Design an enzyme around this catalytic site. Sequence first.
Site, mmCIF file in Angstrom:
data_model
loop_
_atom_site.group_PDB
_atom_site.id
_atom_site.type_symbol
_atom_site.label_atom_id
_atom_site.label_comp_id
_atom_site.label_asym_id
_atom_site.label_seq_id
_atom_site.Cartn_x
_atom_site.Cartn_y
_atom_site.Cartn_z
ATOM 1 N N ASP C 43 0.837 -1.190 0.000
ATOM 2 C CA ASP C 43 0.000 0.000 0.000
ATOM 3 C C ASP C 43 0.880 1.251 0.000
ATOM 4 O OD1 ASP C 43 0.968 -0.336 2.519
ATOM 5 O OD2 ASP C 43 -0.963 -0.193 3.551
HETATM 6 C C1 8Q1 Z 1 5.670 13.276 17.817
HETATM 7 C C2 8Q1 Z 1 4.337 14.018 17.889
HETATM 8 C C3 8Q1 Z 1 3.563 13.951 16.575
HETATM 9 C C4 8Q1 Z 1 3.061 12.543 16.267
HETATM 10 C C5 8Q1 Z 1 1.544 12.420 16.397
HETATM 11 C C6 8Q1 Z 1 0.907 11.855 15.130
HETATM 12 C C7 8Q1 Z 1 -0.564 11.494 15.321
HETATM 13 C C8 8Q1 Z 1 -1.163 10.869 14.064
HETATM 14 C C9 8Q1 Z 1 -1.934 9.585 14.357
HETATM 15 C C10 8Q1 Z 1 -3.409 9.700 13.984
HETATM 16 C C11 8Q1 Z 1 -3.609 9.945 12.491
HETATM 17 C C12 8Q1 Z 1 -4.875 9.271 11.968
HETATM 18 O O1 8Q1 Z 1 -5.330 8.348 12.553
HETATM 19 S S1 8Q1 Z 1 -5.679 9.868 10.455
HETATM 20 C C13 8Q1 Z 1 -6.286 8.433 9.520
HETATM 21 C C14 8Q1 Z 1 -6.750 8.874 8.134
HETATM 22 N N1 8Q1 Z 1 -7.825 8.018 7.667
HETATM 23 C C15 8Q1 Z 1 -8.184 8.022 6.261
HETATM 24 O O2 8Q1 Z 1 -7.599 8.716 5.504
HETATM 25 C C16 8Q1 Z 1 -9.311 7.126 5.756
HETATM 26 C C17 8Q1 Z 1 -9.339 6.791 4.267
HETATM 27 N N2 8Q1 Z 1 -8.185 5.982 3.919
HETATM 28 C C18 8Q1 Z 1 -7.207 6.480 2.969
HETATM 29 O O3 8Q1 Z 1 -7.367 7.542 2.471
HETATM 30 C C19 8Q1 Z 1 -5.993 5.626 2.601
HETATM 31 O O4 8Q1 Z 1 -6.321 4.277 2.775
HETATM 32 C C20 8Q1 Z 1 -4.775 5.959 3.465
HETATM 33 C C21 8Q1 Z 1 -5.102 5.753 4.942
HETATM 34 C C22 8Q1 Z 1 -4.332 7.402 3.236
HETATM 35 C C23 8Q1 Z 1 -3.629 5.029 3.076
HETATM 36 O O5 8Q1 Z 1 -3.296 5.280 1.741
HETATM 37 P P1 8Q1 Z 1 -2.648 4.055 0.851
HETATM 38 O O6 8Q1 Z 1 -3.029 2.729 1.464
HETATM 39 O O7 8Q1 Z 1 -3.179 4.128 -0.559
HETATM 40 O O8 8Q1 Z 1 -1.145 4.182 0.828
#
Ligand code: 8Q1
Lengths: 124, 128, 88, 220, 104, 67, 62, 459, 111, 175, 178
Positions: C43
Amino acid sequence: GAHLARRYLGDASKEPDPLRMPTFPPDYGFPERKEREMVATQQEMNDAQLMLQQRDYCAHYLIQLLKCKRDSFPNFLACKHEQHDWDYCEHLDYVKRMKEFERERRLLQRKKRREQREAEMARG
Amino acid sequence: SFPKYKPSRLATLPATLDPAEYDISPETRKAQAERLAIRSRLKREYLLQYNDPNRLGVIEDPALIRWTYARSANIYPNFRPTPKTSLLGALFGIGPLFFWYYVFKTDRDKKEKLIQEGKLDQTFNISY
Amino acid sequence: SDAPPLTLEAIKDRVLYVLKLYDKIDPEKLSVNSHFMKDLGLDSLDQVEIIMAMEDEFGFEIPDIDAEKLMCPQEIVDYIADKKDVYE
Amino acid sequence: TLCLGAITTLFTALCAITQNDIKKIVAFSTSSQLGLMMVTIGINQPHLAFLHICMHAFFKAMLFMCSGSIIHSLNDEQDIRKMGGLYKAMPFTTTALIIGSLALTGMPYLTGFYSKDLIIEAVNMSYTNAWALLMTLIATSLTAAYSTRIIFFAFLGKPRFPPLVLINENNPLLINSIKRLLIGSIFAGFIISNNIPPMTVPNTTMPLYMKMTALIVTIM
Amino acid sequence: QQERDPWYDWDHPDLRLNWGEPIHWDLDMYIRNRVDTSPTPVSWNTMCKHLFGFVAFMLFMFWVGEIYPSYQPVGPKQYPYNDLYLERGGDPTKEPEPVVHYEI
Amino acid sequence: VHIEPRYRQFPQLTRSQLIQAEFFSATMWFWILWRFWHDSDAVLGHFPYPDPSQWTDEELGILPDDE
Amino acid sequence: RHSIFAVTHVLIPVWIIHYYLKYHVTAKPYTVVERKPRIFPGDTILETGEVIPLMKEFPDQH
Amino acid sequence: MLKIIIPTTMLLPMTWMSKHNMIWINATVHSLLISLISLSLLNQLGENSLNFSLTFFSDSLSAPLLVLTTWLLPLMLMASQSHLSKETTTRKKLYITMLILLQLFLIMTFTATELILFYILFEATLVPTLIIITRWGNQTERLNAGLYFLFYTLAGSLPLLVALVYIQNTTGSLNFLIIHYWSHPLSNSWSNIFMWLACIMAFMVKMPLYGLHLWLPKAHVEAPIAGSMVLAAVLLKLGGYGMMRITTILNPLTNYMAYPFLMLSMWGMIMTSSICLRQTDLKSLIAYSSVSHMALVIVAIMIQTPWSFMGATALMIAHGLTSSMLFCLANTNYERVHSRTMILARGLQTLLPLMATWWLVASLTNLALPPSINLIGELFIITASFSWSNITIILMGMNMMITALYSLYMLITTQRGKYTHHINNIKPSFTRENALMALHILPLLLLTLNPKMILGPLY
Amino acid sequence: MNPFASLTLTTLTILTIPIMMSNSNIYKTNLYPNYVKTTVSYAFTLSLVPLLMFMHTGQEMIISNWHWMTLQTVELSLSFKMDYFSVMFIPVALFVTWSIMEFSMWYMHSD
Amino acid sequence: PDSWDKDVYPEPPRRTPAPAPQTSLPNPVTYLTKIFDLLVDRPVTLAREFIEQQHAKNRYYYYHREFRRVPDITECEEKDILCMFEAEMQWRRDYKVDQEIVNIIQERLKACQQREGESYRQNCAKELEQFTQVSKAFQDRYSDLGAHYSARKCLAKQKQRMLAERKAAKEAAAA
Amino acid sequence: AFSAPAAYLTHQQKVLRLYKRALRHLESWCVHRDKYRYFACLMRARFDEHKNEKDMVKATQLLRQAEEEFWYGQHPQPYIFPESPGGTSYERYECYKVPEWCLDDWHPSEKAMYPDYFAKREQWKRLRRESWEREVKQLQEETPPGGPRTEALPPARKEGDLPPLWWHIVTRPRERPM
Ligand SMILES: CCCCCCCCCCCC(=O)SCCNC(=O)CCNC(=O)[C@H](O)C(C)(C)COP(=O)(O)O
Ligand SMILES: CCCCCCCCCCCCCCCCC[C@@H](O)O[C@H](CO[C@H](O)CCCCCCCCCCCCCCC)COP(=O)(O)OCC[N+](C)(C)C
Ligand SMILES: CCCCCCCC/C=C/CCCCCCCC(=O)OC[C@H](COP(=O)(O)OCCN)OC(=O)CCCCCCC/C=C/CCCCCCCC
């Protein structure tokens, strides 16, 4: 530190003031005080050009140390006895200053307590 | 959840913390498309003369000329005497002069008055 | 003197080396023309981690816009060769 | 002068302990030493300040040369977070940097001892501002703190640099320069201290605890 | 100009400008050799508070230490010839008031 | 002196650099030990600090709260 | 060819400097002033041969 | 002193009779010879001046100015021939004639023994400068610049003439020697106040004074390189020379009439130094630098102390040389790229290294690096002002911080950074430009070697 | 004639020789850094002597050799002070600079 | 040397102590002094001998210019321009001579401060008094004249000072 | 630096960029390798926990919260590669980069040395002169009437053409010129 804590937290009225010291005359508690004698003449001290801060009652040992330092120049580890004597008599001067401080402190506390006691006796 | 960050004039807000870029509309997408179109047109215009073998000299930039002309020659024709303009001009052009005059006059009067009484410690003051 | 004049074969060898230590990538199934998404079934996050591994290995950062486009080890090799003016 | 020196040395020593760029850490160490020199001037001890200038030049320049050697070896990398285990990979550089750090921290009988120790013991025994004294003591503890940070992050542990190992310090120019400044940073303090006429009244009578203050704060 | 994207192929990379785009009225002030307005990890008006508090606290504590000085429990230093009256400025024709130090 | 890169292996070390480093560390420690053995007073203090409380009142000369 | 550097970079400049200082700078008053050498009890002056007496019978706090 | 005046009047027909391709060579060689001849005027006395005749006399304040003028003419000739190559022979001869007439008028101006003849020549210098600026200027603004140059001067100088003749009806003479030997105090009255103002405002507008300086950027930007050189180096010093000559009769009124001018000079020094930091044009930066330095000179002349007089003379000489060099340096880049915008061509050190060295030396001398004569004059003026009042060290200090900034800023803007990618017409520097820069810079350090010769009669 | 003054002046004088040579056919070759390093080392070992003289006899000097200009009552001269501070700081700076130049030869090889 | 008069520029008798060795080790300073002598002072001495021998073959003289005294500005009528010119030149020459006198005294003071070492505060106060006296006299004479100074302005200053002193003395007499 | 930018950044691109920034800053915080691996696996689990959110609004809200948390907890002094726009060797060698057209101003004596190099340079200049007109014609024919909409340039298609606007990209000075 204890003197700083005593003066800045306890009763400072019986604590000596380093800037305004002594407040008692030199022959108050002593029946007679001997005059401190100085070994090196003004001219010798001027000719050696010691410094304005090194011309204390200890200048003779310093002049001796400088002379022996100049004489044994390349052997820079030979003037240990003269340095030790100068340091020792410096230490004696410092001990005398501590003696003066402690004398002034006990004089102040004794005089203040005796004045308070005399006033209390005259108040009854 | 976490302490907030508030922007200032000299410490602006980050792009990732801008609310306006997470609530979007197709109008905003169209606007970005036009922005990229203008930028691409200008870049193509620049790169056509940039790569010309027969071009010798400086590629004149209308933006630079506009900037310099606006900064230098276009100021007086667009100036109007308003209460704000007149007050700021009077302040910044008169206040410092009179303030410094008062300071120096007071200091020199004090110095002269001390001189007359004869107590200034002017010994060794040969060079002046 | 300084570091040696890096060559194309060295870059390709290092790329395949760092890719073969990835647990999600089969060593035998991995080729210089293998596609990450199609041929290897990874992915986007795996691609991001791979690009970060390349940055750590070669000691220079790959901009994100340029990083997304890389999909096969040959593309990474070509990008690194173009970046450092490697021609032999 | 004394107040300016105290605030300078405290602030720069406090800033140095969290830096990751080695050059920044050494620069803040230099600024703290200059603040200590200003403090020494403020207590009416100019010759001690000059002696500290002479003593500090050697090991400061040599520490900077060791840092530059480390930077040049690791492909112009200056962050200590990518500086792995160089204790065994760079033996001569490690030896030099350890000796220089010990000399800076006022380790007894080295170059930094014969000036910094006397400076501290003269400040402790003078009619001065108490806040300046406290700030000087905190600064001389933070000196050992940031020297420990440099040594720990740069030479101990496991490697953190790129895998292409180009570590090579076998060059006569670097070795000779660092060796000369190393011999200086080992013996110049004693040689210079014993070869100048006495320009100061020594502090011979001192309480046991206060005579040792610099060593205790450095160890803490 | 520091806020602009450094990974873009600018026409003038050093100035981070493109040919033909409008130029800010204060470009020479923002040339990134100069005033910077890029975001900081800590908010403005919070760095100001901590910095001003630190400087004010240090000033106040320096003054407090000045009013509560530290010294050693010793008497004044003693110099033989009337506190070196002739040494500190001469004046050998005035006969100063004798200064006497006694043994203890 | 020619040394080539190692690529994830310990770098090549010549005997001369190890000899130099060991010699200089040893000479620093020898100098410190020798100087402490000969000049301990510079660290531990040389003259004893007296206690003012033990000083008798006769030598300091204050009257016994009588006059 | 071997020690030529020490001749055209040390010897010639010092010859010129010594000539200039000895025969031109020193020809005018107060151009070169050295602080008076230290004199201690017990030295003998080079010019007049005067011997400085000893120093007041040390108390000898041995 | 006709041994220097006649050779210029002979330069005139020599130029007008030369072959079409030998005008520049003849003019340059004979101007240099005349400068060598004028070098002999520096042998001055210690008590009185060299009174040559009933019409001309030479002091130790005018001899350095004459040497500077006779030295500057060949530099102007060298700088001018690059952009006049396409010009016709007759117009080139007319340009050289304008330059020769300007030098002749300046030479007779700095040595007139009477005030009215000095006024006549100091006003006659307007015509060649105005003709040059208006006729051989490059852009359309030159016309307006000329007007701003003309009337700003004349409005200040017309009252002076009246005052001058009034003095002749009161004291009976305008000769400087008689005026000095027969000086009488000026009482505190309104008539004396307006006489003071009439005698002072001409030289104030020539310096120029802050608030009266709006003509200087126009004139020094729209003029050709020779015109800019002659306005910056010598023409601004006429006001200082006139003020030094005329303040002998204004005492003790000046003691309190200098306050508004002192305040204007100091605050406008600060203001112009601040202006130089935000300037999109390279010639206007040098113009405002000139304004700041001449404000310092005005302060020195107004406080009326020997140290201030020496500092003022040294500062005028040093500023003339420095500003002429800076203008030539800017004109080289302008001739290369045909634009005065400073941020157009950058990173020129990579392309023109020796010109970068010339820029560095000129900018270091501009910000008064010791032991250059710029700093000698500046430090003498600062010390005299400190004696005048202790608070001045604030304002002066501020200036000494700002000045250097903009100086280095200019350098960092023009020589450092990365080169402009689309500019590919930057030819290597010619021998002519390098020789011009060397002939500008070497006399500065040579004068630093012997600074007593530009310190005026108060030395 | 008491070589203290001559040696102290020569120590500063010989440092400017490469500056005068920077327009010759040694500033264009690759032997210039070694030339400057050797000059600095020689200056250091020459300056080591006035330090010995001071450490022996405490000798100090002022040399006002050139008279630059004189104001009405202020005389400005090219004068040098060779007290304890100068004779103690010059050799240390020269030693540090010598080592630094040696280090520079290797650190700045690719420049 | 005899190039300058030693009464205008006096010095103390320059006492120096004899060396007193106390160690068996050699003294490197004397060794280096011998080497410096033999390697520098002798060739320079020979070159100077050659130069002086060449100079003595061509000897010629130059003289100090002597100026007579002309009537001062006090013997000068209000509008007699020639006598004013002569008096003004004489006044300027006297001003230069006075400046040189003050310069000589300042050189004496600097020589004391350097020579006396750590005892300069006491050992050379006589020259401090001399400089104070000469500076007070110079300041009374010429200070505050400003630029465009002349003999007339100095005369007016002297008359004003004389009037003030006479008034103060006459007031103190009545006390 | 080589690829033409797009009109806007997609949600996937924004999430990927946040992932890279968070991982790099966490590495800056976690100096040691094993600790970094442990916390990077934890961060990967956090990121892929919500990978399957069908509602874009809640996904963008999660992205907003992640950006705010990153800004609060970012390393004040993060690691930067030496030649990155924040590194210590960012523009170190720009003083050594000289454009090729300067070689047109060399004196013939200077050009006498390196004759083969200048022959090859003449070859390249003649090739550029011969291909410029075809490049211009191809750009004219391929461009839409409303002008270009992106900064992407077409490749060569005919027998022996060169990609349009290639001279100043192919003849880059160098990364380490001198
Ligand atoms: C050190 C201090 C900073 C660190 C803190 C960081 C905190 C961040 C953690 C929380 C972030 C989240 O959960 S935000 C989660 C975001 N969720 C979505 O985007 C749902 C739809 N899914 C998609 O668009 C794709 O599947 C995708 C996921 C992009 C993958 O892409 P590929 O599969 O095509 O590579
Ligand atoms: C942009 C820059 C242009 C150049 C600026 C040059 C500045 C010129 C200003 C002239 C300075 C002094 C002029 C007058 C001298 C005294 C000033 C006067 O105002 O003070 C009081 C004068 O009192 C009153 O103020 C009278 C003057 C009032 C009428 C003048 C109008 C002032 C308003 C400011 C207008 C701006 C003028 C400049 C226009 C450009 C002093 O009291 P007094 O002792 O009794 O007068 C002394 C003269 N005596 C001895 C003959 C008696
Ligand atoms: C007495 C008069 C002067 C007193 C000082 C008053 C304040 C002066 C303000 C000067 C304004 C000058 C404006 C133009 C200068 C050039 C532009 C400029 O400076 O840009 C800022 C430039 C870029 O910032 P970086 O951190 O390097 O970022 C690089 C990484 N991206 O940085 C600077 O140069 C900062 C310079 C401004 C500092 C001025 C403030 C100093 C105040 C000092 C007060 C304390 C006095 C000390 C008293 C001690 C007791 C005796």
